[PDB]
Amino acid sequence: LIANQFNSAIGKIQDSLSSTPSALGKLQDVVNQNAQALNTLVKQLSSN
Amino acid sequence: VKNKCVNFNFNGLTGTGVLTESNKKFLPFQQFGRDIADTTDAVRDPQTL
Numbered sequence: 001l002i003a004n005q006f007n008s009a010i011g012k013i014q015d016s017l018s019s020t021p022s023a024l025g026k027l028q029d030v031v032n033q034n035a036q037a038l039n040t041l042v043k044q045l046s047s048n
Numbered sequence: 049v050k051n052k053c054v055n056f057n058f059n060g061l062t063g064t065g066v067l068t069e070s071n072k073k074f075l076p077f078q079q080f081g082r083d084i085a086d087t088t089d090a091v092r093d094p095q096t097l
């Protein structure tokens with residue numbers, strides 16, 4: 001019973017990760033923040 | 049001159065870089081392109097289009 005529960009939990013974890021494009025938001029926020037900071041730094045060159 | 053690091057002055061657009069043949073397709077009124085961060089990345093030659 002414990003082995004079956006463990007296997008089912010692992011399968012459900014994979015399914016939850018696959019079918020939810022918001023679980024990994026913590027890394028996505030860091031990537032977006034770095035990219036946006038670089039974009040703002042570059043765009044600051046076009047100011048008099 | 050292409051494929052070399054050379055200055056350019058294309059219709060008042062001045063800069064330094066390497067000019068290569070591109071696969072982009074400007075509309076027949078645009079003179080030069082830009083990137084997402086407002087950086088010059090492509091130019092239409094005024095004598096060969």
Ligand SMILES: *[C@@H]1O[C@H](CO)[C@@H](O)[C@H](O)[C@H]1NC(C)=O
Pocket residue numbers: 094095096097
């Ligand atoms: C005059 O302009 C046309 C259009 O750009 C170009 O094809 C032609 O070569 C020009 N004449 C020159 C550069 O002698």
